Design a protein around this ligand. Structure first.
Ligand code: SRM
Ligand code: SF4
Ligand SMILES: [Cl-]
Ligand SMILES: [Cl-]
Ligand SMILES: [K+]
Length: 536
């Protein structure tokens, strides 16, 4: 069979598209062919690239592709359009678990760039830092490694940050601690921080998550692979869901693979699915390359059969009938102070306004973690931060800290609690609109106008990529250009009725291309009409 012949092959320890499969391939594919991105790290190609001047780099397609494309395999994103010559940098941070000494190291990096530095918590409970310049990269990379961090394979056609339960290990109601799994996935994916070329040539990005909570903080429905906790014949394992994605062209919720694996087949099955997708995924139209297109093209039974054959021992159990997720569970709030599983300890959830932090904030967060916590922080997919492991006797002193007074509140105004916003055009070259500052301003004006009790989830995304996941929001805003009074302005498509949890739903467009200046009255009506709000 032509179709089921692997499109890529091992060639000198990297994985390259065969000469017979070059028909109709997209620009990303061409770039990957012209040079294996992983050589930048694995043959220390970065050390040489970091010395070439910026305009020497710009003079050739190969080196300009190195900086604009291949460097994303090392977690480095050139902000060509909004931050020319500087790089955002993005980690692996499985489960969102960071240390105070990681957080201090990142602060020391972004501090070098003064006002060209800052950082962000992301919608995959991850750190990004900003302001990085190419000559600093080899030392930054060494410095990440010293504090137990990697930035490998965090952008482009790679396995993205493994998402788990932000309360793993400390949650009194958790189903299973997700940390050992998200950690093993990340370790497998980066070959213990060395780089793993076997999984670095996918037809597109690939999101993985491990569910350990009844709340489904992990968003299984919108991941390429979701691991759902489930017993089979008295053994603990996971039912598998595949193909969930957001793109400008199409969104899909994850579907059952009709498969169950035992606890220690988590890595083997990740491997088998990744390998099936690598080998078989389409590499033409870039907008038909997400794994769900393969699942549709072969059918799920057809895709499933390709997973079986790449399993050790050719075996993949059928789905277990009854999973461990309580179908009727009210999602818990984690902002504020909450009892932990461990007696006499609490976790404290801090509101990070649209996930943006400065060097000083980071150093302060790291100190508060040491002084009051266990030197650990838990990042969340709503772009917030929890300090876990606070002895109850220390809470009151923590509560008085200027950081919690002036920047990161345990008790933000209702509408701010759950406000999520993607990078936007401050730095994102693909953005049509400014998100972070504007969303805060519009929400501040909105709350001044309403009494509301329900903690409405509001998501602001800068373009149709939907990195801020507007299709799961109660009200979502997707950046577009529109017309005001003849002038071309920043506007938004307004989404309604996305749901998260067990009864999840993708919302659809409520109103098209609304000028952003006209958003407040529309949002108030939407709050008043759908979410229990009472006017002025
Ligand atoms: C930082 C983050 C948004 C945020 O403010 O939190 C982000 C921002 C970027 N995303 Fe994303 N994505 C973010 C997670 C998401 C998610 C949410 C999720 O994963 O649950 C989605 C939708 C779910 C999904 O992927 O299926 C997502 C959809 C994408 C897409 C659409 C991919 C597609 O199939 O079309 C792109 C465009 C692309 O890859 O070609 C995009 C591409 C980008 C780039 C790399 C665009 C670029 O070339 O500059 C953004 C970098 C901007 C910057 O400077 O930060 N990003 N992006 C998230 C970082 C996640 C992480 O730490 O790894
Ligand atoms: S949704 Fe668009 S503007 Fe926002 S981070 Fe993603 S690519 Fe950039
Ligand atoms: Cl990318
Ligand atoms: Cl750009
Ligand atoms: K936030």
């Amino acid at each position: 069979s032509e179709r089921l012949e692997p499109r890529v092959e091992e060639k000198d320890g990297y994985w390259v598209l065969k000469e017979k499969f070059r028909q109709g391939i997209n620009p990303a594919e061409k770039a990957k062919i012209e040079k294996e991105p992983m050589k930048l790290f694995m043959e220390n190609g970065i050390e040489d690239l970091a010395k070439i001047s910026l305009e020497e780099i710009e003079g050739s397609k190969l080196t300009k592709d190195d900086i604009d494309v291949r460097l994303k395999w090392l977690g480095l994103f050139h902000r060509r359009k909004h931050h020319y010559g500087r790089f955002m940098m993005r980690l692996k941070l499985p489960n969102g678990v960071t240390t105070s000494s990681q957080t201090r190291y990142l602060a020391s990096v972004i501090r070098k760039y003064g006002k060209d530095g800052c950082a962000d918590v992301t919608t995959r409970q991850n750190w990004q830092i900003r302001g990085v310049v190419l000559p600093d990269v080899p030392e930054i990379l060494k410095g990440l490694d010293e504090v137990g961090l990697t930035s490998l394979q965090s952008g482009m056609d790679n396995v993205r940050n493994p998402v788990g339960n932000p309360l793993a290990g400390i949650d009194p109601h958790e189903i299973v601690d997700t940390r050992p799994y998200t950690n093993l996935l990340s370790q497998y994916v980066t070959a213990n921080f060395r780089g793993n070329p076997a999984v670095t040539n996918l037809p597109r990005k690939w999101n993985v998550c491990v569910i350990g909570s009844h709340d489904l903080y992990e968003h299984p429905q919108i991941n390429d692979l979701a691991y759902m906790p489930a017993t089979k014949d008295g053994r603990f394992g996971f039912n598998l869901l595949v193909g969930g994605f957001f793109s400008p062209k199409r969104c899909a919720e994850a579907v059952p693979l009709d498969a169950w694996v035992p606890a220690d087949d988590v890595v083997p099955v990740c491997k088998a699915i990744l390998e099936a997708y690598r080998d078989l995924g389409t590499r033409g139209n870039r907008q038909k390359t997400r794994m769900m297109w393969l699942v549709d093209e072969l059918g799920v039974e057809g895709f499933r059969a390709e997973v079986v054959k790449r399993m050790p021992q050719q075996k993949l159990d059928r789905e277990s009938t009854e999973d461990l997720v309580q179908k009727q569970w009210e999602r818990r709030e984690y902002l504020g102070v909450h009892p932990q599983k461990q007696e006499g300890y609490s976790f404290v959830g801090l509101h990070i306004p649209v996930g943006r932090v400065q060097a000083d904030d980071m150093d302060e967060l790291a100190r508060l973690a040491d002084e009051y916590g266990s030197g650990e922080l838990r990042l969340t997919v709503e772009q917030n931060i929890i300090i876990p492991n606070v002895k109850n006797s220390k809470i009151e002193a923590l509560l008085n800290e200027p950081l919690l007074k002036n920047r990161f509140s345990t008790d933000p105004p209702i509408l701010m609690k759950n406000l999520v916003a993607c990078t936007g055009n401050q730095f994102c070259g693909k953005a049509i609109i400014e998100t972070k500052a504007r969303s805060m301003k519009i929400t501040e004006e909105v709350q001044l106008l309403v009494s509301i009790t329900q903690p409405v989830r509001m998501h602001w995304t800068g373009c149709p990529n939907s990195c801020a996941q507007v299709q799961v929001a109660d009200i979502g805003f997707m950046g577009c250009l529109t017309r005001k009074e003849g002038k071309t302005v920043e506007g938004a498509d307004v989404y309604l009725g996305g749901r998260i949890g067990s009864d999840s739903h993708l919302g659809d467009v409520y109103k098209k291309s609304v000028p952003c200046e006209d958003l407040v009255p529309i949002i108030v009506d939407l709050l008043v009409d759908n979410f229990g709000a009472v006017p002025r």
